[PDB]
Amino acid sequence: MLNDPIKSTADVRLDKEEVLSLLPSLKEYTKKSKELKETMGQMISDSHEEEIKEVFV
Amino acid sequence: LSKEIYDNESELRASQSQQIMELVGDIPKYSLGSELRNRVEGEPQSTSIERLIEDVLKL
């Protein structure tokens, strides 16, 4: 299952600002994903997963 | 005489039928999809977003 490209628009470029304003909840999903990745990275760095993964083998 | 009158009027009608078929096309048929001409003729009774997407990129 590849990252399928957008269909051919016959020289109409992908205006990301217009389609981003067309789907305004995507910015809310983006900031929620940023907060989730921030909290998960804070959980990961506290757990020393890479540290105990690299000190063993 | 009526046969010759009809033949002359058919010869006059030939140039008119060639001119009124060679007008501005105004985006004519046999160029759109099925759903575009079905929305032109009205009451399609079967909507399908995938065919609308695949036909709106063909205009």
From Swiss-Prot, chain A:
Residues 19-57 are annotated as: Interaction with NKP1-NKP2. It is found in: Nucleus; Chromosome, Centromere, Kinetochore. Present with 2688 molecules/cell in log phase SD medium. Component of the heterotetrameric kinetochore subcomplex COMA, which consists of AME1, CTF19, MCM21 and OKP1. The COMA subcomplex is part of a larger constitutive centromere-associated network (CCAN) (also known as central kinetochore CTF19 complex in yeast), which is composed of at least AME1, CHL4, CNN1, CTF3, CTF19, IML3, MCM16, MCM21, MCM22, MHF1, MHF2, MIF2, NKP1, NKP2, OKP1 and WIP1. COMA binds the centromeric nucleosome-binding protein MIF2, and to the outer kinetochore MIND subcomplex. OKP1 interacts directly with AME1, with an NKP1-NKP2 dimer, and with CTF19-MCM21. Component of the kinetochore, a multiprotein complex that assembles on centromeric DNA and attaches chromosomes to spindle microtubules, mediating chromosome segregation and sister chromatid segregation during meiosis and mitosis. Component of the inner kinetochore COMA complex, which connects centromere-associated proteins and the outer kinetochore. COMA interacts with other inner kinetochore proteins to form the inner kinetochore constitutive centromere-associated network (CCAN), which serves as a structural platform for outer kinetochore assembly. Belongs to the CENP-Q/OKP1 family. This is Inner kinetochore subunit OKP1. The gene is OKP1.
Swiss-Prot record, chain B:
Signal peptide: none annotated. Belongs to the NKP1 family. It is found in: Nucleus; Chromosome, Centromere, Kinetochore. Component of the inner kinetochore constitutive centromere-associated network (CCAN) (also known as central kinetochore CTF19 complex in yeast), which is composed of at least AME1, CHL4, CNN1, CTF3, CTF19, IML3, MCM16, MCM21, MCM22, MHF1, MHF2, MIF2, NKP1, NKP2, OKP1 and WIP1. NKP1 interacts directly with OKP1 and AME1. It comes from Saccharomyces cerevisiae (strain ATCC 204508 / S288c) (Baker's yeast). This is Inner kinetochore subunit NKP1. Component of the kinetochore, a multiprotein complex that assembles on centromeric DNA and attaches chromosomes to spindle microtubules, mediating chromosome segregation and sister chromatid segregation during meiosis and mitosis. Component of the inner kinetochore constitutive centromere-associated network (CCAN), which serves as a structural platform for outer kinetochore assembly. The chain holds residues 62 to 120 of 238 of the full protein.
